[PDB]
Amino acid sequence: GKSKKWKEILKFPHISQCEDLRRTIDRDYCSLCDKQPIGRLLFRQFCETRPGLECYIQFLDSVAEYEVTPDEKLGEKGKEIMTKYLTPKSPVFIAQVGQDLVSQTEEKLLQKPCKELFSACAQSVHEYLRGEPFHEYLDSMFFDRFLQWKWLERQPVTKNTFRQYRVLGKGGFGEVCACQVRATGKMYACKRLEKKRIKKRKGESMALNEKQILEKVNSQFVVNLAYAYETKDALCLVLTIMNGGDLKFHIYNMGNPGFEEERALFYAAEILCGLEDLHRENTVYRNLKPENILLDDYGHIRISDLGLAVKIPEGDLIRGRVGTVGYMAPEVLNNQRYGLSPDYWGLGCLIYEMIEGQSPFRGRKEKVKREEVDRRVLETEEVYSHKFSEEAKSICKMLLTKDAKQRLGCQEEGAAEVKRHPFFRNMNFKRLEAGMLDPPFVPDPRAVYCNLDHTDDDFYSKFSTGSVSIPWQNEMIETECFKELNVFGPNGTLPPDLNRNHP
Numbered sequence: 359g360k361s362k363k364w365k366e367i368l369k370f371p372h373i374s375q376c377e378d379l380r381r382t383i384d385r386d387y388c389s390l391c392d393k394q395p396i397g398r399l400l401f402r403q404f405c406e407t408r409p410g411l412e413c414y415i416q417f418l419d420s421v422a423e424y425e426v427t428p429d430e431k432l433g434e435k436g437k438e439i440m441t442k443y444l445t446p447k448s449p450v451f452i453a454q455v456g457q458d459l460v461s462q463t464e465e466k467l468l469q470k471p472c473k474e475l476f477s478a479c480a481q482s483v484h485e486y487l488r489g490e491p492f493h494e495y496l497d498s499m500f501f502d503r504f505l506q507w508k509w510l511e512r513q514p515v516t517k518n519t520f521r522q523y524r525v526l527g528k529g530g531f532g533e534v535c536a537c538q539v540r541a542t543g544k545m546y547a548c549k550r551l552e553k554k555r556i557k558k559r560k561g562e563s564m565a566l567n568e569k570q571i572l573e574k575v576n577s578q579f580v581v582n583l584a585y586a587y588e589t590k591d592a593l594c595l596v597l598t599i600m601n602g603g604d605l606k607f608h609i610y611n612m613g614n615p616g617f618e619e620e621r622a623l624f625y626a627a628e629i630l631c632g633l634e635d636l637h638r639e640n641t642v643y644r645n646l647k648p649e650n651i652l653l654d655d656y657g658h659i660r661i662s663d664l665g666l667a668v669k670i671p672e673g674d675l676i677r678g679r680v681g682t683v684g685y686m687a688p689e690v691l692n693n694q695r696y697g698l699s700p701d702y703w704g705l706g707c708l709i710y711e712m713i714e715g716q717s718p719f720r721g722r723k724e725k726v727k728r729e730e731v732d733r734r735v736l737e738t739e740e741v742y743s744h745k746f747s748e749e750a751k752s753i754c755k756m757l758l759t760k761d762a763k764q765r766l767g768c769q770e771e772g773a774a775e776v777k778r779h780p781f782f783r784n785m786n787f788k789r790l791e792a793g794m795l796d797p798p799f800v801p802d803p804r805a806v807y808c809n810l811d812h813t814d815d816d817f818y819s820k821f822s823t824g825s826v827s828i829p830w831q832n833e834m835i836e837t838e839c840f841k842e843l844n845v846f847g848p849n850g851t852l853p854p855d856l857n858r859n860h861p
């Protein structure tokens with residue numbers, strides 16, 4: 359439901375309005391041709407015009423397909439790629455990959471196949487585009503078009519930019535709403551943080567902390583921040599909309615009182631990726647419990663409620679006793695200097711509680727006091743049943759290790775150590791991260807699974823930053839606002855908005 363005059367709102371500005379952007383934009387190689395979604399498409403579209411650069415883009419696309427291809431079908435896809443791109447007489451022959459590297463893969467495919475067979479060649483291709491083909495695209499109309507999109511991205515975001523519909527859930531310092539961008543129509547989840555509730559409770563640094571962490575991290579398994587604006591009496595965070603309910607609901611209301619091992623395996627594999635992306639920013643979540651694992655419309659999961667997340671300084675440990683009863687690692691209950699370990703303890707609580715149907719330290723029918731639940735986390739060894747395969751028992755007790763020094767994933771290797779666990783012996787992570795594995799449960803669409811100080815003005819400056827770059831560009835692509843607006847002159851000629859002669 360895009361606005362009536364959305365083409366006027368997203369109307370491209372004349373390229374002369376983008377001179378300040380031309381020189382302030384860092385021209386990093388693939389910060390503009392890969393990371394930034396629209397930038398990637400425009401550079402790709404720049405190569406579509408050239409005959410030589412054409413075949414280099416088609417090759418990379420074919421390599422991406424090989425990485426997710428099933429195992430028994432690798433040797434097949436492998437041959438197709440070489441006979442199409444690496445044969446010297448091909449119509450789409452790759453040249454900048456030296457003959458001393460096409461004969462290399464000749465030996466790779468002569469043996470068993472590995473999903474990273476063409477990795478050597480792919481890097482060689484990018485290394486070529488990084489040079490002349492990139493600097494050419496910089497002086498091309500597509501980069502001028504890229505600046506036009508950036509101009510729109512940076513525009514101020516206010517309240518008329520959106521269209522709240524209902525209040526879906528309420529929590530601390532505010533509540534959550536269902537927000538919609540008018541010009542694009544995309545549905546988001548607004549987070550109305552009441553302004554006078556923050557200053558009273560003196561939690562201004564905790565609000566910023568979550569807002570900075572959310573914008574810095576993007577992922578398919580953690581709620582993303584697309585906008586952050588200030589308003590009268592409230593401060594808003596525009597986050598991903600999750601209509602599939604939480605994992606607590608599906609474990610106890612719509613299961614056994616639990617899941618099958620294979621079903622829990624899926625959700626676990628996605629949660630692990632969600633934690634890996636948060637650790638790439640050396641950020642610890644510390645709030646891993648079933649009601650915080652939400653499901654989207656397709657059946658996939660994301661982590662939410664990062665209010666307790668904090669960015670750990672590299673080589674430094676934090677101290678704090680936060681979390682929810684039962685889901686606090688022993689090192690957190692002890693109030694010690696810990697790192698990212700509490701999340702792997704939480705992941706152990708999650709996998710266990712999904713398969714068995716109860717907390718590993720409190721029965722579903724047991725009524726115990728906070729003190730006793732805590733003693734078991736520190737003094738009691740969990741017990742397993744015939745619902746856990748020998749691989750499912752191992753990962754849970756390894757992740758539920760009391761001593762965070764011998765806990766899985768808490769080594770220099772990180773989350774990579776967990777993915778290699780036999781419990782994920784049947785999980786292809788490259789295909790999961792690509793969204794190619796069908797979720798085990800698909801939520802139904804109609805389902806309903808449920809004062810004037812100046813210092814206050816200074817705190818707003820760092821919060822109300824505006825639209826987040828990557829989520830914003832994707833929104834333009836999702837809503838097909840890019841497909842419609844990204845139009846040029848007929849027969850590869852400059853359009854009016856990109857002609858410095860007549861504005």
Ligand SMILES: Cc1[nH]c(/C=C2\C(=O)N=C3CC=C(C(=O)N[C@H](C)c4ccc(F)cc4)C=C32)c(C)c1NC(=O)c1ccoc1
Pocket residue numbers: 526527528529530531532533534547549550551581597598599600601602603652662663664665805806807808
């Ligand atoms: C669609 C939808 N999203 C959400 C919710 C979210 C979302 O989507 N993304 C995110 C990201 C982060 C949070 C988050 O920080 N939370 C904590 C607890 C919080 C903190 C401060 C507050 F002030 C309020 C809450 C929530 C969400 C909810 C409920 C529905 N409602 C249903 O799913 C539904 C429909 C019928 O029945 C139930």
